[PDB]
């Protein structure tokens, strides 16, 4: 039950700006400034039968109205979720709540999402109030202070115990709440927010999200209290968005400070589409619009781009000597042996010239220095990646490409991703405007562009899921039930609100169903079922025809083929150009489908003209987003695309004359002309190659399949409906109903799955795995094997527990165990490592054997699991790196041993440190003294030199 849904407009004036246009962007007011406007939205989720008085009349006991409303709620003692951009001023709301609790002699808690941000907030809060303390997973300081900044992860472990500190706690402030949707660590936020006391109030600070009300309602239902939302797209530093068509000299304003899309400038920008980074930085330098961040999505793209900046220097020798002193002082924190590291020496010349690199591969010391030198204005252009929460604002931000790389494809940047990165432009006070520039290399459609630069932010969708360590922890605690979590998870709340919108689609879907009725239903249905059976068997022969054994012999150059990639995009009839085996340079010996085992280059004449074909890779058949068959009434351009065999609908009996160099100039045009002729001489269609007479497929099972088809056709030819004039008419009326009926049956089950509690079956399945492995008794009373799994959190709690109790680490050496545990701390992918020596392959196979024993139990317990996928999820590629690091090898030796970036090695070593420290504490509970001495020797062996070095 909701109410009080008023919007209110707030206007202000800012200095005028022509930006990069040779003309003013917005009509200036009489005062010589430009008037802007933003909207502040408010709603409240009320619990049933609650005495509520509408806001905009609260009295308090340099502010924006979105702060005034949110503060008014805090003054009234009701929870509030604030949604606004990164610089909009949300911290003003947290400070009021942190103050209102002090003036009442009450305690307030503050949770920070990522690492050090709490520690910096700890120091920042002391200066503002004094009566503040810090509690964290790493260190613990001052609990007795009135206010306490605390890690979010530490709070979840603290609420299971029920430390009763909440006795005199009035407000819990969650900063950057939208991290609750993180697929890896988002479950924690939901867990802690579920376990909050109903008597405590909350202040939720989140970025711009559309579904802010779904979160407030969820708060309202769980904790039986009203919950407000305050939303505003308000951008404090106004932004200007430009498009830079590649290889051109143009710059076009596509959307301005009022978020209005400039149509004419766009079509001009697209007209120009027919080095580049160098031009844009030199422009921004001469126009004094620095600092700049040029975002690349790959770590190598950043370093390569900065290398292309070899010519320019942005710093005077006084500044070059200045930053070099800061650089050298920070390097001093490293051991003298690591101060001559190649990554360190090679980056200094770039820094002296005023150009910086910032990516996850950097050493922890270097990343920190580069961040500071950029703050000091010593670095004028920063080559960075999307992954950053840091305070690194620049006044102009540039994107290398208009597309982001997906796991296997190049996808268009999403509306949200543009919002999250354009926000890195503009600085409060310093800059009158923020500039974002996007280099585009494709004749993108208008509606696609509006969806990007003017799109909407991502929704805050729950990522709650059951965990084995979570379930075991709930068994030790007597007060909270796993069923209770599911019933209160934001996930469950999102399903119970989904079924009324699904029921509307269902009742609408059946309205079309009742209105359809086909005469002679029995005869029409039989004809439909037979044709469907024929459709199925004929698709089955296609797989036999397209299989490499039979197809490859007939895939000569010029062969005519019908292309239907992924059963969706139909390119019509084309000509085979060449074919070769698929090898997968990355992650070799990867399994391929028999039909996907080969890649065929085919010429097509139905490609949409403005499709960006320049993105095509020679052996990557995943067609990038935007490469599509020409729609009706659209121009066609000849091109060559790669396809797997599954993308062939039928193989032709004809074959063209192909030039030696199809890549030559105007050759695709001449072949496209011949394709037009073959398509013209055969308007009804191209004859296919006969599988038995022509292709000589003689397999006996194949012959039985063909006979199964012939039977249904003569069966079809003897149906009463075959000789009817209304056949096409009476069949479409039925086939439209059958599709509807299958759609309705799908939705009928979909609502059933959401009618019950979510993953309630999954909870019973996980518990079955625990009882089977011996982690709890057949009556789910916790066992010792289960108790030790509660202590493990930096890795697979089940497998690490089974390895410890099975004595796998007993027969090993400390250098061997460290390499084994490396498979539990390295999650990112890398190049396949060389074959392991027998000293490291034996404990690996000894763990892979236990892993399969677990995977089979998960599959047998009815959990959706691929056995092969699970065993390979424990990356062993760094085993030799960790092993030699323990044997005394230097950091310079192990870096030349893998393609993993230096910073990533540091992160996993430290992540391995955290895991080994957990197994040390576990040896105390299990009472295994031999294991304690083992893991401690492992920790001292890893913790040396660079990994042991500290931060600034």
């Amino acid at each position: 039950m909701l109410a009080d849904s008023f919007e209110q407009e707030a206007s202000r004036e800012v200095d005028a700006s022509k930006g990069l246009t040779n003309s003013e962007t917005l009509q200036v007011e009489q005062d010589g400034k430009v008037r802007l406007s933003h909207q502040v939205r408010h709603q409240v989720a009320l619990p049933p039968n609650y005495d509520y008085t509408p806001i905009a009349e609260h009295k308090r006991v340099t502010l924006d109205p979105f702060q005034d409303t949110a503060i008014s709620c805090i003054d009234r003692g009701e929870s509030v979720l604030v949604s606004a951009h990164t610089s909009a001023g949300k911290t003003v709301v947290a400070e009021y709540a942190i103050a209102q609790s002090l003036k009442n002699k009450q305690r307030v808690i503050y949770t920070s999402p990522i690492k050090a941000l709490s520690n910096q907030k700890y120091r920042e809060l002391l200066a503002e109030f004094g009566d503040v303390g810090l509690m964290t997973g790493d260190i613990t300081i001052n609990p007795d202070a009135g206010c306490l900044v605390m890690t979010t992860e530490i709070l979840r472990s603290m609420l299971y115990r029920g430390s009763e500190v909440m006795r005199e706690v009035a407000w819990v402030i969650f900063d950057e709440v939208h991290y609750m949707r993180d697929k890896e660590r988002g479950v924690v936020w939901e867990e802690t927010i579920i376990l909050l006391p109903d008597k405590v109030r909350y202040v939720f600070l989140s970025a711009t999200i559309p579904n802010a009300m779904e979160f407030a309602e969820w708060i309202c239902k769980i904790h039986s209290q009203p919950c407000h939302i305050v939303y505003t797209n308000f951008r404090p530093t106004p932004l200007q968005h430009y498009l830079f068509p590649a290889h051109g000299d143009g710059i076009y304003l596509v959307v301005d400070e009022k978020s209005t899309f400039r149509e004419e400038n766009f079509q001009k920008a697209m007209a120009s589409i027919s080095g580049d980074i160098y031009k844009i930085v030199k422009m921004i330098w001469k126009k004094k619009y620095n600092p700049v961040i040029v975002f690349s999505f790959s770590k190598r793209d950043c370093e390569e781009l900065a290398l292309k900046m070899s010519k320019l220097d942005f710093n005077s020798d006084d500044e070059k000597e200045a930053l070099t002193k800061i650089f050298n002082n920070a390097i001093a924190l490293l051991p003298e042996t690591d101060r001559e590291l190649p990554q360190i020496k090679h980056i200094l010349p770039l820094l002296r010239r005023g150009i910086g690199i910032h990516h996850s591969g950097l050493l922890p010391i270097l990343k920190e220095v580069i961040e500071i030198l950029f703050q000091e204005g010593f670095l004028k252009v920063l080559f960075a990646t999307e992954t950053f929460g840091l305070n690194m604002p620049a006044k102009t931000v540039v994107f290398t490409s208009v597309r982001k790389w997906d796991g296997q494809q190049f996808r268009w940047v999403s509306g949200g991703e543009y919002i999250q990165m354009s926000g890195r432009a503009g600085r409060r006070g310093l800059d009158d405007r923020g500039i974002v520039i996007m280099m585009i290399d494709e004749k993108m459609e208008p509606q696609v562009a509006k969806g990007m630069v003017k799109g909407q932010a991502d929704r805050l969708d729950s990522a709650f899921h059951l965990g084995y360590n979570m379930i075991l922890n709930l068994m030790r605690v007597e007060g909270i039930s796993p069923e209770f979590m599911l019933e209160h998870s934001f996930f469950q709340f999102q399903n119970v609100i989904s079924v009324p919108v699904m029921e509307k689609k269902l009742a609408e879907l059946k309205k079309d169903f009742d209105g359809i009725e086909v005469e002679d239903e029995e005869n029409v249905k039989e004809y439909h079922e037979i044709e469907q059976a024929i459709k199925g068997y004929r698709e089955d022969v296609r797989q036999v025809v397209t299989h490499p054994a039979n197809a490859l012999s007939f895939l000569q150059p010029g062969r005519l083929v019908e292309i239907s990639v992924n059963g969706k995009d139909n390119y019509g009839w084309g000509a085979v150009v060449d074919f070769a085996k698929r090898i997968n340079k990355r992650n070799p010996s990867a399994v391929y489908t028999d039909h996907e085992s080969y890649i065929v280059n085919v010429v097509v004449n139905t490609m949409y003209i403005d499709s960006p074909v320049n993105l095509l890779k020679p052996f990557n058949p995943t067609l990038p987003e935007g490469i599509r068959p020409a729609e009706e009434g659209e121009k066609s351009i000849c091109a060559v695309i790669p396809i797997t065999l599954d993308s062939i609908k039928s193989i032709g009996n004809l074959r063209l004359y192909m030039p030696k160099d199809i890549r030559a100039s105007g050759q695709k045009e001449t072949v496209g002309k011949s394709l037009r002729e073959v398509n013209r001489r055969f308007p009804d269609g191209i004859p296919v190659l006969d599988p038995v007479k022509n292709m000589k497929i003689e397999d006996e099972d194949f012959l039985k399949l063909m006979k199964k088809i012939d039977v249904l056709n003569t069966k079809l030819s003897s149906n009463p409906l075959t000789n009817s004039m209304r056949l096409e008419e009476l069949y479409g009326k039925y086939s439209r109903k059958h599709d509807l009926h299958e759609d309705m049956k799908q939705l009928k089950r979909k609502i059933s799955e959401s009618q019950a509690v979510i993953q309630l079956d999954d909870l019973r399945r996980r518990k079955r795995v625990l009882r089977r492995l011996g982690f709890c008794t057949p009556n789910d009373i916790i066992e010792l094997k289960g108790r030790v799994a509660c202590e493990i959190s930096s890795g697979d709690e089940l497998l690490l527990t089974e390895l410890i109790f099975n004595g796998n680490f007993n027969e090993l050496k400390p250098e061997q165990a460290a390499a084994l545990l490396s498979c539990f701390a390295f999650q990112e992918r890398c190049k396949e490592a060389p074959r392991l020596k027998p000293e490291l392959a034996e404990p690996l196979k000894a763990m892979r054997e236990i892993a399969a024993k677990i995977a089979k139990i998960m599959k047998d317990s009815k959990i959706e699991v691929v056995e092969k996928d699970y065993v390979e999820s424990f990356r062993h590629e760094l085993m030799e790196v960790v092993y030699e690091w323990c044997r005394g090898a230097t950091f310079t030796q192990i870096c030349k041993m893998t393609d993993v970036y230096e910073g990533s090695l540091i992160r996993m070593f430290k992540r391995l440190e955290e895991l080994v420290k957990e197994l040390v504490d576990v040896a105390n509970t299990i009472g295994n003294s031999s294991l304690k001495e083992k893991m401690e020797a492992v920790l001292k062996l890893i913790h040396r030199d660079i990994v042991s070095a500290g931060s600034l």
Partner: peptide
Amino acid sequence: ALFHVDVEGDEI
């Protein structure tokens, strides 16, 4: 003309 009809499969 611009092509030929081919029904034989190379490499047996």
